[PDB]
Structure formats: structure tokens, C-alpha cells
PDB file of N, CA and C in Angstrom:
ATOM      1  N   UNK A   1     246.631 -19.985 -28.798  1.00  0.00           N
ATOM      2  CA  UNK A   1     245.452 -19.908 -27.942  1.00  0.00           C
ATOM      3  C   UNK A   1     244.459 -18.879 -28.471  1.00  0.00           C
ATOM      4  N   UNK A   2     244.792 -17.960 -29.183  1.00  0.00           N
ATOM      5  CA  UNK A   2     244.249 -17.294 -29.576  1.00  0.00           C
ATOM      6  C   UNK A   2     243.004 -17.746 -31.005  1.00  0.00           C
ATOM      7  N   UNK A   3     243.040 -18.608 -30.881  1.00  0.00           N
ATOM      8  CA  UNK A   3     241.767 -19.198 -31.467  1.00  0.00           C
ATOM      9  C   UNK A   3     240.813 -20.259 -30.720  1.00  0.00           C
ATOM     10  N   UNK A   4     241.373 -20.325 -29.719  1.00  0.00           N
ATOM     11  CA  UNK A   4     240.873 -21.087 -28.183  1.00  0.00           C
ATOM     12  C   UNK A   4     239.946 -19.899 -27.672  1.00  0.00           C
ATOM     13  N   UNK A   5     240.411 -18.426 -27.355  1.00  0.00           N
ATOM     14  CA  UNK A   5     239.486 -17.334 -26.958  1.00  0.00           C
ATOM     15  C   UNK A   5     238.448 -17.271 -28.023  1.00  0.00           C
ATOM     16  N   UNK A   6     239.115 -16.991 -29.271  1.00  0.00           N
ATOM     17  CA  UNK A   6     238.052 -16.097 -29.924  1.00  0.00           C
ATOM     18  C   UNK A   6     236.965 -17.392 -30.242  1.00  0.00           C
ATOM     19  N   UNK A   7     237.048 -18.112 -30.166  1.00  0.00           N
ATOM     20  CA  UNK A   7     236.066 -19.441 -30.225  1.00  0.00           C
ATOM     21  C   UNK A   7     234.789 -19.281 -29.742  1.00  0.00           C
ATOM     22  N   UNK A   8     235.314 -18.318 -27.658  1.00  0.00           N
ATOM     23  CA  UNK A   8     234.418 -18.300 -27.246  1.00  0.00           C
ATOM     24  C   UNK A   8     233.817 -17.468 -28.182  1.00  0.00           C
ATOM     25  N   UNK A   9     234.055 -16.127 -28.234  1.00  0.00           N
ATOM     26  CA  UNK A   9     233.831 -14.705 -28.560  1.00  0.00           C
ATOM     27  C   UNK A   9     232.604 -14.762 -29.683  1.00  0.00           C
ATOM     28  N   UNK A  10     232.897 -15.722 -30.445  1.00  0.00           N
ATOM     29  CA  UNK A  10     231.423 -16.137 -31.219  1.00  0.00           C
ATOM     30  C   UNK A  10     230.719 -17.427 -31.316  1.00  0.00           C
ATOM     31  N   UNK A  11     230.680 -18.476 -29.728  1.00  0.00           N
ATOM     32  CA  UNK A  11     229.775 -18.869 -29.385  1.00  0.00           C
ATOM     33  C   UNK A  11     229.145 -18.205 -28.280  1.00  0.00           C
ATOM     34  N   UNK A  12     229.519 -16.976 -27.713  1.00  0.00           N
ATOM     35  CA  UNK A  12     228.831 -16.223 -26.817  1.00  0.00           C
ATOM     36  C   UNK A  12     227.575 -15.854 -27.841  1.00  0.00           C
ATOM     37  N   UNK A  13     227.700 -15.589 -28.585  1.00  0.00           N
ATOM     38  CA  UNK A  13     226.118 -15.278 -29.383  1.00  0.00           C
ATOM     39  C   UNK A  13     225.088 -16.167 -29.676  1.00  0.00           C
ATOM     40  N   UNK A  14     225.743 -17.470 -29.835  1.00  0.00           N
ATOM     41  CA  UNK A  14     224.763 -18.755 -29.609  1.00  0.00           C
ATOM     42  C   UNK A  14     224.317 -18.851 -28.044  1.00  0.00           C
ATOM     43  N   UNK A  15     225.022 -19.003 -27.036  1.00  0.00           N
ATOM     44  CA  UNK A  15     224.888 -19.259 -25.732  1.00  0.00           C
ATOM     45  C   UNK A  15     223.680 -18.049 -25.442  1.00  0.00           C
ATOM     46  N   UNK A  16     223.281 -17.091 -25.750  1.00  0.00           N
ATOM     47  CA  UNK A  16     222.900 -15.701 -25.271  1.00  0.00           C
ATOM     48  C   UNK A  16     222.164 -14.998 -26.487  1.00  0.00           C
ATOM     49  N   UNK A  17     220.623 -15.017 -26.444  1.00  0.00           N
ATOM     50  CA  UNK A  17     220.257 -14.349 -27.603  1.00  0.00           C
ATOM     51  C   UNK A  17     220.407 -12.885 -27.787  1.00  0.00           C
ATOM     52  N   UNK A  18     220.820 -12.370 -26.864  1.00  0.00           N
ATOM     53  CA  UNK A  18     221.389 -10.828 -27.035  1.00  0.00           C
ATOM     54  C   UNK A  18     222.585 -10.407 -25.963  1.00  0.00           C
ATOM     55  N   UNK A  19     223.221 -10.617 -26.911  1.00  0.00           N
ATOM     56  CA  UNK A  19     225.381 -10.239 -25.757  1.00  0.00           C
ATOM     57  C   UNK A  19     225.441  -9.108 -26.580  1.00  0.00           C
ATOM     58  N   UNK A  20     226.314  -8.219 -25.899  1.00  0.00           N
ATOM     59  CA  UNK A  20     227.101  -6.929 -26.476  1.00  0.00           C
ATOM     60  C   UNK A  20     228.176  -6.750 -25.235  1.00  0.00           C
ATOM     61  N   UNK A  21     229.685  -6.852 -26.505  1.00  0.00           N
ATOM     62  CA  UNK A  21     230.997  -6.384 -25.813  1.00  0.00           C
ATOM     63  C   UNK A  21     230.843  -4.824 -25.108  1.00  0.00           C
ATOM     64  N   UNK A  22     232.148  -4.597 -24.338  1.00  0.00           N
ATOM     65  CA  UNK A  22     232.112  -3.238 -24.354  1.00  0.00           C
ATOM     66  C   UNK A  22     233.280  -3.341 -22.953  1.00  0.00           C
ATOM     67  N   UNK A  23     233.537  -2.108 -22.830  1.00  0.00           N
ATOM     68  CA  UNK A  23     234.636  -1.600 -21.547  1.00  0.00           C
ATOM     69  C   UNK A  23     234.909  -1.309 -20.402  1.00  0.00           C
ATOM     70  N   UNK A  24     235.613  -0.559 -19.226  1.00  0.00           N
ATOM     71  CA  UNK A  24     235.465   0.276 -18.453  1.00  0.00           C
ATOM     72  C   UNK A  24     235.270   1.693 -18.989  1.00  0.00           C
ATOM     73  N   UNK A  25     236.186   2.431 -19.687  1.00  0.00           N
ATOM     74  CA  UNK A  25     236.022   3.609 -20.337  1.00  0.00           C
ATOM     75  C   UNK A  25     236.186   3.988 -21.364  1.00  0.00           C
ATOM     76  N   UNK A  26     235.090   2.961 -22.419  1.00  0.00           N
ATOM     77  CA  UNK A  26     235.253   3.557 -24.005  1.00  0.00           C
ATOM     78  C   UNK A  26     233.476   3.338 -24.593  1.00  0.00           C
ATOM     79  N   UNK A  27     233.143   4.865 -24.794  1.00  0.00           N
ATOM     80  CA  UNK A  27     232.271   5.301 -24.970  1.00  0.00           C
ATOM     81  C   UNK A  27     231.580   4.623 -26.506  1.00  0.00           C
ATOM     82  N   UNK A  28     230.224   5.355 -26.975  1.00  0.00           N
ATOM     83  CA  UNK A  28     229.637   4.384 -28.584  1.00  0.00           C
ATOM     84  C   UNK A  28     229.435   2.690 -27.956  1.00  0.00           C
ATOM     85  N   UNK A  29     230.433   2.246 -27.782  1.00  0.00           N
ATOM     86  CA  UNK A  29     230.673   1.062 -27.867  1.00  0.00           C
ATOM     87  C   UNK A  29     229.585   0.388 -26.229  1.00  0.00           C
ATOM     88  N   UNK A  30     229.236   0.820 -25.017  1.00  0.00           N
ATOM     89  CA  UNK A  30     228.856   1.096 -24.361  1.00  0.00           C
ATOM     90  C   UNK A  30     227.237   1.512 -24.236  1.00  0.00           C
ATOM     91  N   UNK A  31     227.174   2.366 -25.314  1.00  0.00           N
ATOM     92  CA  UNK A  31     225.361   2.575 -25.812  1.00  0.00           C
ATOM     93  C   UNK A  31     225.044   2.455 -26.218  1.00  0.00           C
ATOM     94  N   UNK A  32     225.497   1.354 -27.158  1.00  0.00           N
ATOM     95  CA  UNK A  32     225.028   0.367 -28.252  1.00  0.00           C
ATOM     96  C   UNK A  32     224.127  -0.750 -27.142  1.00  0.00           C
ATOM     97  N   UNK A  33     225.104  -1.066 -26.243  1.00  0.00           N
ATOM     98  CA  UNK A  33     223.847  -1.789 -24.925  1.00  0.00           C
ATOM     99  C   UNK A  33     222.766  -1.425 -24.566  1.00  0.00           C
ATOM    100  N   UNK A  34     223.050  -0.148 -23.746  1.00  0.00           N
ATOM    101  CA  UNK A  34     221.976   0.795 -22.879  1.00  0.00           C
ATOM    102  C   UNK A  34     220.508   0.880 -24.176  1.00  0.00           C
ATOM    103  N   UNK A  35     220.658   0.737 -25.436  1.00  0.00           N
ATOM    104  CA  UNK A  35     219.467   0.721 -26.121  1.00  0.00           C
ATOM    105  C   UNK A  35     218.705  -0.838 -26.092  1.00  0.00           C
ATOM    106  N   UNK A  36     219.534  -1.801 -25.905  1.00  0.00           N
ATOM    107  CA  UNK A  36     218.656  -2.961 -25.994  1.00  0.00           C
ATOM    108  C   UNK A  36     217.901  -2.782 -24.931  1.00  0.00           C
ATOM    109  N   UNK A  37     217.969  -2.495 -23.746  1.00  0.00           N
ATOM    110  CA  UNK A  37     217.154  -2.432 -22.639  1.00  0.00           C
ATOM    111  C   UNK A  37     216.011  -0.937 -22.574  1.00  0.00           C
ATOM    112  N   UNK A  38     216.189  -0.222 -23.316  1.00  0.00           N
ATOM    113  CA  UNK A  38     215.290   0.530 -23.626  1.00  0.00           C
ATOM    114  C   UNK A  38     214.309  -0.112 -24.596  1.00  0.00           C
ATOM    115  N   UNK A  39     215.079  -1.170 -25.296  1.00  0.00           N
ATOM    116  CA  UNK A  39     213.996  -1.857 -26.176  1.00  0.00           C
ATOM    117  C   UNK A  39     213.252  -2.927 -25.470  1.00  0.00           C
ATOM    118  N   UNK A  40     213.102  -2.740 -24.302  1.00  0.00           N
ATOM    119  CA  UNK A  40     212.058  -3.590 -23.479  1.00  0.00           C
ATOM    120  C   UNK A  40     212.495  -5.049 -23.773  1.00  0.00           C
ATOM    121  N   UNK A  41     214.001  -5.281 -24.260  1.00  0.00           N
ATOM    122  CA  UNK A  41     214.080  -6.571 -24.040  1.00  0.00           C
ATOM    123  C   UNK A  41     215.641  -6.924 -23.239  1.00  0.00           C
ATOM    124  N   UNK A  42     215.935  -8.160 -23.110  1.00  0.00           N
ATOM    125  CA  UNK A  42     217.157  -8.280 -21.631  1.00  0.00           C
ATOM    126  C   UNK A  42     218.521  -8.400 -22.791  1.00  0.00           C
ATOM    127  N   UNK A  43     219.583  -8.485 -22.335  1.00  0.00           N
ATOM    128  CA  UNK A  43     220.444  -8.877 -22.808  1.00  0.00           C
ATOM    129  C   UNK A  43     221.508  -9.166 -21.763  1.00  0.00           C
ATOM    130  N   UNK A  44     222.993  -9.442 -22.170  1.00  0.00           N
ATOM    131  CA  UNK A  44     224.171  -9.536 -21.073  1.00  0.00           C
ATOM    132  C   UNK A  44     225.175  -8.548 -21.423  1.00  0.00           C
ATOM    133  N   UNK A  45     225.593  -8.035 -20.132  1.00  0.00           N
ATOM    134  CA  UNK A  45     226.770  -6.725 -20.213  1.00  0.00           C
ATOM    135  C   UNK A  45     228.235  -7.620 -20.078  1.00  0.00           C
ATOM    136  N   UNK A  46     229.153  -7.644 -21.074  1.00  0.00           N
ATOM    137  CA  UNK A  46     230.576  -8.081 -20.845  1.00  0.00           C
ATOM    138  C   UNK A  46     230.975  -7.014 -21.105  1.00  0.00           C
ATOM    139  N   UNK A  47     232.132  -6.664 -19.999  1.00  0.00           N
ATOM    140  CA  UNK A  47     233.371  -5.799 -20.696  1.00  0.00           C
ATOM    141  C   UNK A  47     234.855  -6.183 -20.475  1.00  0.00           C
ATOM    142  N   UNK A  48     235.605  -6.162 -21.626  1.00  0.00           N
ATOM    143  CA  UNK A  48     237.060  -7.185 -21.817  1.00  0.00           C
ATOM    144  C   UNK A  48     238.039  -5.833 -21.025  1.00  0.00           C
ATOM    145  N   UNK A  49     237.511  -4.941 -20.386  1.00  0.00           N
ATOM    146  CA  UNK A  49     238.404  -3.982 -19.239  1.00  0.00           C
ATOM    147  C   UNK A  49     238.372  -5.138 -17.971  1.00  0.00           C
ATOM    148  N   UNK A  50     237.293  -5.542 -18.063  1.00  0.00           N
ATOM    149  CA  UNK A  50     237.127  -6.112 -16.771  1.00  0.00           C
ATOM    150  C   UNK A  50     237.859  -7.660 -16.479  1.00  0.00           C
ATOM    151  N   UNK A  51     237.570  -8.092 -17.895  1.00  0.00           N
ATOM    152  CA  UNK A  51     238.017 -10.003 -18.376  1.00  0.00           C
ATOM    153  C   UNK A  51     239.392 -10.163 -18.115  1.00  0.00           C
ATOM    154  N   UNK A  52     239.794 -11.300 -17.172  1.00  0.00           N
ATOM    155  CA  UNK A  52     240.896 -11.737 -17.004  1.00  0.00           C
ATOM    156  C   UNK A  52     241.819 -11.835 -18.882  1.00  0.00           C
ATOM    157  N   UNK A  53     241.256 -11.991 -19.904  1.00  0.00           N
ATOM    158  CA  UNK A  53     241.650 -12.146 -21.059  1.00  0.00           C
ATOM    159  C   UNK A  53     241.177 -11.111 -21.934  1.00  0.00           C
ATOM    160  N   UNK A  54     241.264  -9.753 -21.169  1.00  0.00           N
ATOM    161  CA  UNK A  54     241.136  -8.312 -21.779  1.00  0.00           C
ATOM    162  C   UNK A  54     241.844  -8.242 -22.765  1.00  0.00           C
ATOM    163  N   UNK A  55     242.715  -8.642 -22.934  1.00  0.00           N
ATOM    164  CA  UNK A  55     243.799  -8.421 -23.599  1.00  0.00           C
ATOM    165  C   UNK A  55     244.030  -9.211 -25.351  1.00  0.00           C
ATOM    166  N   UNK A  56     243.676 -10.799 -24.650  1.00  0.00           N
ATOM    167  CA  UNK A  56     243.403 -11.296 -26.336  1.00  0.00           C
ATOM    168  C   UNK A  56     241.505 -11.232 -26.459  1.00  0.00           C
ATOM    169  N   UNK A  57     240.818 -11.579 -25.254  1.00  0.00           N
ATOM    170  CA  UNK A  57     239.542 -11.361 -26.099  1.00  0.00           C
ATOM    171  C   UNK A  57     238.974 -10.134 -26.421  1.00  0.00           C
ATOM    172  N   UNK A  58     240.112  -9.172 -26.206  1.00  0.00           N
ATOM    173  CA  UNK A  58     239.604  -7.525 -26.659  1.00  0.00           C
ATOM    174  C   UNK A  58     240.085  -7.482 -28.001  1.00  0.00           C
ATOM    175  N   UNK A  59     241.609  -8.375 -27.985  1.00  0.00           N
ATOM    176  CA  UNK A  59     242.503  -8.266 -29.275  1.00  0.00           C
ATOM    177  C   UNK A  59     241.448  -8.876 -30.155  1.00  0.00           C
ATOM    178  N   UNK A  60     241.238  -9.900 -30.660  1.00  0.00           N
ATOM    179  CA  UNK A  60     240.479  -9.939 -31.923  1.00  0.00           C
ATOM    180  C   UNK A  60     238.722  -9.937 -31.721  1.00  0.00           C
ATOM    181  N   UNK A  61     238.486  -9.196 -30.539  1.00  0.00           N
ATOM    182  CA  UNK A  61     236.733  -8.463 -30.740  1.00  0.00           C
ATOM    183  C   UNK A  61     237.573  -6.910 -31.844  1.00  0.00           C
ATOM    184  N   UNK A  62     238.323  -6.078 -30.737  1.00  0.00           N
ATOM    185  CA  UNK A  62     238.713  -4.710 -31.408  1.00  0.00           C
ATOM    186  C   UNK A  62     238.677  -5.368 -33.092  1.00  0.00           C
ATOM    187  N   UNK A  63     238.913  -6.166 -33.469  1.00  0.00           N
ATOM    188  CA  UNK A  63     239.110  -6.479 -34.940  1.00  0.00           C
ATOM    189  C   UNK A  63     237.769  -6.770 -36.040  1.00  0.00           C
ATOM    190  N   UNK A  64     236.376  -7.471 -34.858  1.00  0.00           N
ATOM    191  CA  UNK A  64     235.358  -7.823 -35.396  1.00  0.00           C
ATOM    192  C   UNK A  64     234.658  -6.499 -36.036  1.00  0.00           C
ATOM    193  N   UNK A  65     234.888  -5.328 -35.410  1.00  0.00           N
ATOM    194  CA  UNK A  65     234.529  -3.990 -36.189  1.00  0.00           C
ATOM    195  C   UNK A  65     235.505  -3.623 -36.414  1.00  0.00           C
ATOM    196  N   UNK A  66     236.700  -3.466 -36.189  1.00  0.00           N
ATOM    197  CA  UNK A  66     238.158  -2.918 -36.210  1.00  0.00           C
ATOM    198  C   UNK A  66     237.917  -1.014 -35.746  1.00  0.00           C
ATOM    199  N   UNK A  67     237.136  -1.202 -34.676  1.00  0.00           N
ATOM    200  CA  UNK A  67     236.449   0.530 -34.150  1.00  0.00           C
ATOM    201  C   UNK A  67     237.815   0.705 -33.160  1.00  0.00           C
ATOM    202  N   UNK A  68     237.988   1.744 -32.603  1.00  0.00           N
ATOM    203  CA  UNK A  68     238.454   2.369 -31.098  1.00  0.00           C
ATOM    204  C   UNK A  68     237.622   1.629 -30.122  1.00  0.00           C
ATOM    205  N   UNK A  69     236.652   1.183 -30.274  1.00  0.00           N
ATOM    206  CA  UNK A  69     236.074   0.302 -29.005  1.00  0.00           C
ATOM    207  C   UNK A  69     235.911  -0.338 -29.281  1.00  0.00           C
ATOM    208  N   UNK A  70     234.945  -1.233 -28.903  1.00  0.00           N
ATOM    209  CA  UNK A  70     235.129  -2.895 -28.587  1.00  0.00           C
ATOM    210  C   UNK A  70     233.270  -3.177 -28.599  1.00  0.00           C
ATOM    211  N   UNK A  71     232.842  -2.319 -29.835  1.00  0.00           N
ATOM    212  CA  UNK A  71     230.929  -2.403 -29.929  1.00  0.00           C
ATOM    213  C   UNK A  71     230.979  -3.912 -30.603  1.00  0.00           C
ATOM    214  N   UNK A  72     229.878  -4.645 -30.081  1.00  0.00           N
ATOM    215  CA  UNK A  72     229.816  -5.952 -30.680  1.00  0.00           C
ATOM    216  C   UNK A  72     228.079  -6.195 -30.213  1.00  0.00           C
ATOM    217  N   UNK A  73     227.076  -6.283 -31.469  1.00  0.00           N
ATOM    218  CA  UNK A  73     225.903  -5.734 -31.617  1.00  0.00           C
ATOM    219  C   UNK A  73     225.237  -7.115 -32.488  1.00  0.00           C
ATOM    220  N   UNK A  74     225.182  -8.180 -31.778  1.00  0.00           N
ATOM    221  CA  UNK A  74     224.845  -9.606 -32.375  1.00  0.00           C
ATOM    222  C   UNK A  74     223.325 -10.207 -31.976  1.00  0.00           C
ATOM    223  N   UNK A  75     222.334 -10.098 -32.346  1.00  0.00           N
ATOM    224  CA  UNK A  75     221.034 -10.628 -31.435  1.00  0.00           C
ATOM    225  C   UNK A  75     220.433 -12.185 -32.291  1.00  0.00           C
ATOM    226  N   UNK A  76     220.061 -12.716 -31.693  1.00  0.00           N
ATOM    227  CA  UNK A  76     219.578 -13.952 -32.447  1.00  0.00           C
ATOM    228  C   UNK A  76     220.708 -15.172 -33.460  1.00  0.00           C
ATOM    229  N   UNK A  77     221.411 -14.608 -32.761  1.00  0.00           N
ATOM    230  CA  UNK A  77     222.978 -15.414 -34.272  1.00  0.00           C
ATOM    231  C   UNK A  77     222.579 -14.568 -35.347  1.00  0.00           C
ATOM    232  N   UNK A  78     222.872 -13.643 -35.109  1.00  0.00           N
ATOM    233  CA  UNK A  78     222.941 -12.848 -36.775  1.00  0.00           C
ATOM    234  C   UNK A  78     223.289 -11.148 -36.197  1.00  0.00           C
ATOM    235  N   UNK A  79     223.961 -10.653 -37.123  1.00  0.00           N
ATOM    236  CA  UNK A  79     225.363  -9.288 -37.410  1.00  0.00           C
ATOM    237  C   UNK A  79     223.814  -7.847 -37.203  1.00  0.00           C
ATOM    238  N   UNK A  80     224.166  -7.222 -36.215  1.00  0.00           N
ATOM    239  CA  UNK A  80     223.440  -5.899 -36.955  1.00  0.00           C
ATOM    240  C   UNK A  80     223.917  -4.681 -36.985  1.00  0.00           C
ATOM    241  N   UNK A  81     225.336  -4.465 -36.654  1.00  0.00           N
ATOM    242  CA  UNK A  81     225.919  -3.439 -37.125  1.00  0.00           C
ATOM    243  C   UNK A  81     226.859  -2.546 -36.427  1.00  0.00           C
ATOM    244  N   UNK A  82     226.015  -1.531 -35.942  1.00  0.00           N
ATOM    245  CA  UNK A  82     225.868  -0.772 -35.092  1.00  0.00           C
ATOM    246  C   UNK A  82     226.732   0.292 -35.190  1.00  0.00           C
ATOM    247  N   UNK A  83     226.837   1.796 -34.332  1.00  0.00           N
ATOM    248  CA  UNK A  83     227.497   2.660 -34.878  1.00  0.00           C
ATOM    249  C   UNK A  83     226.924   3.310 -35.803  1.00  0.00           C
ATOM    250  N   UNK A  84     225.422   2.568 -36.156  1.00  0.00           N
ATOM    251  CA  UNK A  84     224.435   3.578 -37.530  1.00  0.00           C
ATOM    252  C   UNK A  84     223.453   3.027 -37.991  1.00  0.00           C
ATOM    253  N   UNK A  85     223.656   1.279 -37.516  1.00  0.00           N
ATOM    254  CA  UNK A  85     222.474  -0.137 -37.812  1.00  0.00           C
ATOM    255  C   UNK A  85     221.959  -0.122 -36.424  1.00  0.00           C
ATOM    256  N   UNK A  86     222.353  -0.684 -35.202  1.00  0.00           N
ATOM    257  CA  UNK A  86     222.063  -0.300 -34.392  1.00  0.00           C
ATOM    258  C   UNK A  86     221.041   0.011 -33.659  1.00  0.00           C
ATOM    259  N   UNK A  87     221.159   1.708 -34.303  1.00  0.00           N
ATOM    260  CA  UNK A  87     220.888   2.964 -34.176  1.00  0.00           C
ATOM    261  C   UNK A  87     219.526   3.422 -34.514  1.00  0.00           C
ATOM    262  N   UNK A  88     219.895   3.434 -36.296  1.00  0.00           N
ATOM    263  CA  UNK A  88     218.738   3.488 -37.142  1.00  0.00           C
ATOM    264  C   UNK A  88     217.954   2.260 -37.129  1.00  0.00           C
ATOM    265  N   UNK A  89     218.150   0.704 -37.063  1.00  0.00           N
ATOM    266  CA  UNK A  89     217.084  -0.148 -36.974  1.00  0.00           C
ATOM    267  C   UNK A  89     216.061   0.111 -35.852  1.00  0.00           C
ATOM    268  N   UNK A  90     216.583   0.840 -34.512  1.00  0.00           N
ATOM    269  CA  UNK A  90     215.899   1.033 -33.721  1.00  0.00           C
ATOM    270  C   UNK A  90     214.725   1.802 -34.202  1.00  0.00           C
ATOM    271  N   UNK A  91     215.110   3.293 -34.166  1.00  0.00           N
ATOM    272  CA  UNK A  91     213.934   3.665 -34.857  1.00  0.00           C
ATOM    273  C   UNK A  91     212.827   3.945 -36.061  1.00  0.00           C
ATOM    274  N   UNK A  92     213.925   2.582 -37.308  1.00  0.00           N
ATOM    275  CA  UNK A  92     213.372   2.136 -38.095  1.00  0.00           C
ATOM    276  C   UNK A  92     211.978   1.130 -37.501  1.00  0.00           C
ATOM    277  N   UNK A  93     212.739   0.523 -36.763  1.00  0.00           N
ATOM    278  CA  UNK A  93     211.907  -0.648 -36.762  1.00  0.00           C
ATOM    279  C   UNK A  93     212.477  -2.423 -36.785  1.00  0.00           C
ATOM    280  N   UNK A  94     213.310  -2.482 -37.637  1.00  0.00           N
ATOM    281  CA  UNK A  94     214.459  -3.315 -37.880  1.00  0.00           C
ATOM    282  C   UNK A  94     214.479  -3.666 -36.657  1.00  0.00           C
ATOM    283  N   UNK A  95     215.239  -3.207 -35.599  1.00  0.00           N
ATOM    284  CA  UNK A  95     215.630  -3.903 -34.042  1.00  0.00           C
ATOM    285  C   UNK A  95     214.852  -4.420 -33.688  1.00  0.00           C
ATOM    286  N   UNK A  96     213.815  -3.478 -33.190  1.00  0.00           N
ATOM    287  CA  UNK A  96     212.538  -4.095 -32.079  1.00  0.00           C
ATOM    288  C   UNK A  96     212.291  -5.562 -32.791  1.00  0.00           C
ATOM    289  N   UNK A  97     212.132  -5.581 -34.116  1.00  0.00           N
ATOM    290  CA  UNK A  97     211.617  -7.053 -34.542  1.00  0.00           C
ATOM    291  C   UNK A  97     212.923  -7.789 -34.745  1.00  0.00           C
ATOM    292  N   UNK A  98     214.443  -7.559 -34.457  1.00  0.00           N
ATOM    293  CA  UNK A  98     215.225  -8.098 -34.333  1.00  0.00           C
ATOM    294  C   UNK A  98     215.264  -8.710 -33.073  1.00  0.00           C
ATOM    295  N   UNK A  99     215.300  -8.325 -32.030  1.00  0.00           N
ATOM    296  CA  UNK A  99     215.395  -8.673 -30.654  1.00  0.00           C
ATOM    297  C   UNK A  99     214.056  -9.421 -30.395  1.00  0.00           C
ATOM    298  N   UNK A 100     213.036  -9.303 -31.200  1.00  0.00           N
ATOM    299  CA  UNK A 100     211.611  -9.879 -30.453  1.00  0.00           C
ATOM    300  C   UNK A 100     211.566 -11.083 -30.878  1.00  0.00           C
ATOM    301  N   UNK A 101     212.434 -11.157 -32.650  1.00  0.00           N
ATOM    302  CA  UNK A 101     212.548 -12.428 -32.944  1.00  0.00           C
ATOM    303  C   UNK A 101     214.107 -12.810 -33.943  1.00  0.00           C
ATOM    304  N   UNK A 102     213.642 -11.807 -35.017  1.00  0.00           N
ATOM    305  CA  UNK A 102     213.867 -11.967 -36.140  1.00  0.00           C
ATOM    306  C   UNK A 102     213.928 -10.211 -36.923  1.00  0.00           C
TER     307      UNK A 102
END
């Protein structure tokens, strides 16, 4: 089954032009969100503390960065990092025109 979950885990990024994983109490992974909405644009809050399938869809997200948390930083169908991409595209510049389009 475990390729039945993670199936979803990366068509949630098609379904949703801006998803980011995250927890009840594991930090980084958590304010990697709180910046998309400072970037004046929407996104969706999941956290696999909360998911009836915490357990395997945390098991191979924890693996998509292989971090202590569960950061998962995907806008438009395409990878941006985070933990330092993120971060720096923001106030590069990179994000804002990631999230606006591209």
C-alpha cells in the first residue's frame, strides 16, 4: 500500500498549485508555509501529525528531503527546495515569481 499513499503524496502537487507538508510539533518544516502567505499568495496546510496515515504518508514524505521534519516546498509541479531555496528565492526573487507563475 505503500505506493497506494505515496501516489497521493505527489499528485497533491498537481491537485493544488501550492501544498506544503508539515506537523503538530516539528519546527523549519512548519515556516517553510507561514512564508507562502506572506508572499501574498494562498496555499494548503497538511500535517501527517494530524493524517489518519501519519505514519506511512509521513514515512516516505520524511524521505522526500530525508530532514527531521516533514518540509515539502512544491509550487506549480516543480521542486524548490527549501531549508535555504525556500528561503533565499524569497528574497532573491526566485519565489515571488515562482508562486505568481513560474
Amino acid at each position: 500500500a505503500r505506493e497506494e499513499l505515496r501516489r497521493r503524496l505527489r499528485d497533491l502537487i498537481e491537485g493544488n498549485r501550492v501544498m506544503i507538508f508539515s506537523k503538530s510539533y516539528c519546527p523549519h518544516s512548519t515556516r517553510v508555509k507561514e512564508l507562502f502567505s506572506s508572499l501574498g499568495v494562498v496555499y494548503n496546510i497538511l500535517e501527517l501529525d494530524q493524517v489518519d496515515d501519519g505514519a506511512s504518508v509521513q514515512e516516505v514524505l520524511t524521505e522526500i528531503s530525508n530532514q527531521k521534519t516533514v518540509p515539502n516546498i512544491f509550487v506549480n509541479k516543480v521542486h524548490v527546495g527549501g531549508c535555504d531555496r525556500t528561503f533565499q528565492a524569497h528574497q532573491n526573487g526566485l519565489l515571488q515569481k515562482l508562486l505568481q507563475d513560474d
